[PDB]
Paper text:
ADP-ribosylation is a reversible post-translational modification involved in various cellular activities. Removal of ADP-ribosylation requires (ADP-ribosyl)hydrolases, with macrodomain enzymes being a major family in this category. Further analyses reveal DUF4804 as a class of [name]-like macrodomain enzymes whose representative members show unique selectivity for mono-ADP-ribosylated arginine residue in synthetic substrates. Crystal structures of several proteins in this class provide insights into arginine specificity and a shared mode of ADP-ribose interaction distinct from previously characterized macrodomains.
Numbering used by the authors: 11 to 498
The structure:
């Protein structure tokens, strides 16, 4: 399955060659004892009020502060090695094809500095179809982001202060993961309620932010690569070019970035007729859904989930229990066949990675409408030759994210929780607008420590670009410095 595990070594131009070269000198931040003190103080200095206060560090039991200290040092941003090539190609593309507004931002941007831009320049909240937003600096509003990065952008929505839709398209491929304490079971309606003497709460594990495909904004983000529409998929906008056909405009070079990221052609309207294998229906009757590009986008995210859980479980010498949510299948779902592509691609990447998942024990698909998909069914086993437990258990049922792993079948495993995030929002998203129970994003920030540990304004040492980790199927999960040393 795609992407291939071996035979890789990304091509990289001279431009991306050097920026990855300069990453070999990025010092890996080392954790200590005063990590909690900086988080506690910077959390009090955060200019925005939390949705709930119970997830704050100072309200956790002091006997657990030593473990929370290690959890602060365990946080890092994370991208696929596939995405690393795209980031470097994007920087190169913006360096030459950027307008007068974009060029002062993107040139001389190191790789790690671009990741840092994708972390700090997010809005606090950024949701709904009309783009309701709240910035960390306090400004709020709705809409107005399509102008960001152009000649007629208006403050406070300027490229130097917020992200453009081109940035958000790449930020959707950027994840943040960390060990975490679980404040409550993590049901959607938890709203930060704490039951101090509960008997069913797995209190610590791993939390990983996954971002689905945003498909409802026309001509923007994953719509550009997955939905084949009349207005967008034209020859004048870069669509329909061959592999080595050189791009001579900005639109052609932008489409080249994504043709070569997904390793497939894009399509002009009319070339794609629904065959229900690569081309399926969308919600617009006159559009066409690219089932292949949707699979490859989910494939990238699933590699990050499985390789990250395998690294966390390997460090504590345990087996990973991955609580898998359907990111992009909730309020962001756009095709009825997305969930089938979701689970088909998940099982594909589980078999393709294979022995690279020797420390993954169980995959739990929670809140999915499909109950069986190929080898995936409740209680099934994805056979992997050489696996310590002969394979990976599959469970398909509604489950609270932090429900205690009390069963003897799962006793002592490392609970790895995925949650549906946003590329242009801090952990919780609408959590920062006092909406605590509307999505899995806001429910997670009410039940874990992501609002501080996955916050680049609070956990400044370990949640920055200088701590970027690369999920490579070949080399595992490594810090950006070690990945650069081992591929250059
Ligand atoms: N009550 C529920 N309990 C548990 N899971 C549920 C529930 N209802 C739906 N699900 C499943 O929860 C899963 C995820 O649904 P979502 O949380 O919308 O995620 P997305 O990726 O679609 O939308 C993310 C955007 O919305 C946020 O604001 C972000 O910040 C982004 O802006 C699906 O399988 C649902 O069926």
């Amino acid at each position: 399955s795609w992407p291939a595990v071996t035979g890789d070594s990304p091509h990289l131009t001279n431009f991306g060659r050097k920026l990855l070269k300069d990453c070999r000198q990025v010092q890996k931040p080392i954790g200590g004892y005063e990590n909690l003190g900086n988080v506690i103080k910077l959390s009090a200095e955060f200019p925005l009020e939390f949705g709930v206060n119970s997830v704050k560090v100072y309200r956790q039991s002091p006997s657990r502060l030593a473990r929370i200290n290690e959890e602060v040092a365990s946080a890092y941003p994370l991208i696929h090695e596939r995405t690393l090539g795209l980031y470097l190609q994007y920087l190169e593309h913006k360096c030459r094809w950027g307008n007068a507004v974009e060029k002062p931002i993107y040139r001389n941007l190191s790789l790690c500095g671009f990741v840092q831009r994708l972390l700090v320049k997010r809005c606090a909240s950024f949701f709904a179809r009309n783009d309701k937003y709240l910035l960390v600096s306090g400004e709020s509003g709705a809409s107005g982001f399509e102008a960001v990065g152009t000649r007629e952008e208006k403050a406070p929505l300027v490229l130097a202060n917020v992200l453009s839709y081109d940035d958000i398209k790449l930020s959707a491929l950027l994840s943040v993961s960390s060990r975490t304490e679980f404040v409550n079971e993590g049901e959607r309606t938890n709203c930060g309620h704490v039951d101090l003497n509960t008997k069913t709460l797995e209190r610590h594990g791993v939390i990983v932010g996954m971002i689905g495909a945003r498909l409802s904004r026309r001509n923007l983000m994953e719509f550009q690569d997955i939905v084949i529409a009349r207005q967008q998929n034209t020859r004048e906008r870069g669509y329909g070019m061959a592999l080595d056909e050189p791009a001579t405009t900005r639109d052609e070079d932008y489409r080249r970035l994504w043709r070569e990221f997904y390793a497939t052609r894009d399509l002009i309207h009319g070339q794609a007729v629904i065959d229900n294998q690569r081309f399926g229906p969308s919600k617009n009757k006159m559009d066409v859904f690219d089932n292949l590009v949707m699979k490859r986008r989910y494939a990238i995210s699933f590699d990050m989930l499985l390789l990250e859980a395998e690294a966390r479980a390997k460090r504590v010498k345990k087996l990973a229990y991955i609580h898998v949510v359907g990111f992009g299948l909730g309020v962001w779902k756009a095709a009825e066949q997305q969930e089938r592509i979701f689970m088909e691609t998940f099982e594909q990447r589980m078999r393709t990675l294979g022995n690279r998942l020797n420390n993954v024990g169980l995959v739990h698909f929670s809140w999915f409408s499909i109950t069986h998909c190929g080898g995936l069914s409740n209680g099934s086993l994805i056979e992997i030759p050489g696996h310590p437990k002969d394979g990976i258990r599959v469970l398909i049922s509604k489950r609270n994210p932090a429900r205690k792993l009390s069963d003897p079948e799962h006793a002592g495993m490392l609970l790895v929780v995925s949650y549906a995030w946003d590329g242009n929002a801090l952990p919780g998203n609408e959590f920062w607008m006092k909406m605590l129970q509307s999505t899995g994003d806001s429910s997670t920030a009410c039940s874990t420590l992501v609002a501080e540990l996955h916050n680049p304004y609070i956990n400044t040492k370990f949640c920055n670009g200088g701590n970027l980790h690369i999920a490579s199927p070949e080399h595992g999960v490594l810090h950006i410095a070690e990945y650069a040393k081992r591929v250059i």
